[PDB]
């Protein structure tokens, strides 16, 4: 048996764009830009193949002040749908409560 990890990300420019012919393709070739490039360099040093996915609500993510539900990619990790998140998610205090970010890849 084998598993290919569920890579997840968000629609953002030029981080995630549709390929020139995204109607005519399946597999990772439907997409172009920074994150899909980087994911290859990660996996080629981390030992897996991977299937891309787009987050359902199109938002980075937050915690509801009312229900304390998490939504967005962090929430989808917390509820165990996606496997790994490769996106321009801003590192912040509250997010360290629930996921274990690496060192940053780019300052701003």
């Amino acid at each position: 048996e084998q598993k290919t990890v569920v890579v997840t990300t968000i629609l953002e420019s030029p981080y995630v764009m549709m390929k020139k012919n995204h109607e005519m393709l399946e597999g990772n070739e439907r997409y172009e830009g920074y994150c899909v490039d980087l994911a290859a360099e990660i996996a080629k040093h981390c030992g897996f193949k991977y299937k891309l996915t787009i987050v359902g609500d199109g938002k980075y993510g937050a915690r509801d002040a009312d229900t304390k539900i998490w939504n967005g990619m962090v929430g989808e990790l917390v509820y165990g749908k996606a496997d790994i998140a490769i996106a321009p998610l801003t590192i912040t205090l509250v997010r360290e409560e629930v996921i274990d970010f690496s060192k940053p890849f780019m300052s701003l």
Binding site: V5, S13, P14, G33, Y34, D37, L38, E41, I42, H45, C46, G47, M73, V74, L77, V78, G80, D83, I84, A85, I86, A87, P88, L89, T90, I91, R95, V98, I99, D100, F101, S102, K103, P104, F105, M106, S107, L108
Partner: protein, 108 residues
């Protein structure tokens, strides 16, 4: 709003009292303003997008000065993932050998 700092408070005092409506709801509404009263309305946003927008037509926008603060993006994984070591190491390697710099040179 949070700041200790005199200059930032001096700015916020105007920005919370200026009229007509000084804030904008979206990046598009901002860009659509900055092109109007040319030279007269300055606008603040993420330096990565600021650099990005200059590189496209009509090129009528450009960056100045420097950063007021430091923040950064990072890879994110579920809590306690087995990947939490290899990805975390790998991101260092991709920076120490300039691969990320090469990809940034490409995509900007």
């Amino acid at each position: 709003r949070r700041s200790k700092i005199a200059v930032f408070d001096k700015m916020w005092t105007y920005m919370r009292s200026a009229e007509p409506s000084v804030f904008v709801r979206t990046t598009a509404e901002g860009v659509a303003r900055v092109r109007k009263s040319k030279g007269k309305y300055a606008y603040l946003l993420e330096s990565t997008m600021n650099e990005y927008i200059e590189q496209r037509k009509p090129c009528d926008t450009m960056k100045v000065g420097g950063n007021l603060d430091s923040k950064g993006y990072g890879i994110a994984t579920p809590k306690g993932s087995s990947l939490g070591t290899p990805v975390n190491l790998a991101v260092l390697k991709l920076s120490e050998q300039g691969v990320l710099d090469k990809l940034k040179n490409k995509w900007w």
